[PDB]
Amino acid sequence: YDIQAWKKQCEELLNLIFQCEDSEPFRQPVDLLEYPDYRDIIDTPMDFATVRETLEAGNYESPMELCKDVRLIFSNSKAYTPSKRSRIYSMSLRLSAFFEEHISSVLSDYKSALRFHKR
Numbered sequence: 001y002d003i004q005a006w007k008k009q010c011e012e013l014l015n016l017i018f019q020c021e022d023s024e025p026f027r028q029p030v031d032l033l034e035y036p037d038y039r040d041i042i043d044t045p046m047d048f049a050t051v052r053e054t055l056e057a058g059n060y061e062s063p064m065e066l067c068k069d070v071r072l073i074f075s076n077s078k079a080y081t082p083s084k085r086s087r088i089y090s091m092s093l094r095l096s097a098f099f100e101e102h103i104s105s106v107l108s109d110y111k112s113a114l115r116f117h118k119r
């Protein structure tokens with residue numbers, strides 16, 4: 001029932017993501033010189049360094065907010081990909097499955113901690 005535990009759990013999950021080879025295209029903002037039409041398709045760029053910086057700055061109030069930004073990294077890849085069989089998009093799908101499998105307990109524990117507090 002530790003209401004604050006999610007933060008370190010997210011830091012550790014981000015450390016695992018940064019070690020994953022599948023995160024390489026998503027660690028830093030998409031290089032707009034390499035993909036000149038990127039902002040014509042993508043309204044809100046997102047990447048894992050931005051997520052980590054937002055977390056470390058104390059600018060997420062909950063793991064659900066972090067989860068929305070991570071999910072945006074994946075939806076941006078799905079929206080920008082010219083093919084659902086592309087290399088970078090295929091990396092995003094694997095990384096998304098890894099993230100979802102690991103964030104589930106973080107969200108459950110946080111929500112449980114809030115419920116206990118309210119009780």
Ligand SMILES: O=C(O)c1cncc(Br)c1
Pocket residue numbers: 030035076077078080081082083086087088089
């Ligand atoms: O070239 C691609 O397949 C691709 C997919 N998702 C994001 C980016 Br940037 C590129």
